[PDB]
From a paper:
FliL, a component protein of the flagellar motor, is known to enhance the motor performance under high-load conditions in some bacteria. A flagellar protein, FliL, which is a single-transmembrane protein with a large periplasmic region and associates with the flagellar basal body, has been found to be important for the function of the motor under high-load conditions, such as the highly viscous environments in some species. FliLPeri shows a remarkable structural similarity to the stomatin/prohibitin/flotillin/HflK/C (SPFH) domain of stomatin family proteins, some of which are involved in modulation of ion channel activities in various organisms.
Thus, we concluded that FliLC is a core region of FliLPeri and that the N-terminal 17 residues (residues 41 to 58; FliLL) act as a linker connecting the TM region with FliLC. FliLC consists of a single domain with a bean shape containing four α-helices (α1 to α4) and one β-sheet composed of four β-strands (β1 to β4). The neighboring subunit in the FliLC crystal is slightly tilted compared with that in the FliLPeri ring, resulting in the formation of the helical tube rather than the ring. FliLC shows remarkable structural similarity to the SPFH domain despite the low similarity of amino acid sequence.
Author numbering:
A (entry chain B), B (entry chain A): 58 to 167
Write the structure that this text describes.
């Protein structure tokens, strides 16, 4: 009610920096992320498995193309795929999706 | 009468920087923002859910046009969309809107 929301946020402190390649430009993208989770058990799992979670994120991002990141439909696609990739990796590893979704708090492309 | 509880302002310290591009151009935007809330419980909620709020704001700004930034009508429209997207995110997460509205204290297209 007042004191009872299971929602918590797990900071991912280090920004993700990766190269996206395009027809004229290799570019660097920087993305600051946090994880949204429901409940103390999922929070503990998300903190514990964050090397795995960080590596899932990097793989999703590195697969992105330049005019996917320049397209408003493309950004929503990438955002949702980042969350669903993490859920799939954690389901393989621990049998649980663990997170609700990835949150992106900062995005700069060059 | 609930909407008569006292106003407070929750500062969002980090300015939003994001790219926009289309028929006219490709360039940068900086927005500095704060949240207007009513009452102590909404204020503590706005601070606790700051990762979700910041992510909603970045999502809203990512899907704006360089043409809609140059229109005075579009800028009101952007502000209102931003407030509505935050309220919808928090309604989905805790079942209350939490904020009154978001405030843009700096808005520049450079």
């Amino acid at each position: 009610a007042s004191d009872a929301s299971p929602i918590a946020y797990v900071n991912l402190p280090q920004a993700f920096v990766f190269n996206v390649t395009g027809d004229s430009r290799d570019r660097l993208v920087q993305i600051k992320a946090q994880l949204m989770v429901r409940g103390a058990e999922n929070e503990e799992l998300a903190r514990y498995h964050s090397p795995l979670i960080e590596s899932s994120l990097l793989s999703t991002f590195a697969s992105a193309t330049v005019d996917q990141l320049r397209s408003p439909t493309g950004r929503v696609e990438l955002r949702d795929r980042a969350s669903e990739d993490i859920k799939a990796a954690l389901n393989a590893a621990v049998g649980k999706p663990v997170i609700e979704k990835v949150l992106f708090t900062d995005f700069v492309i060059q």
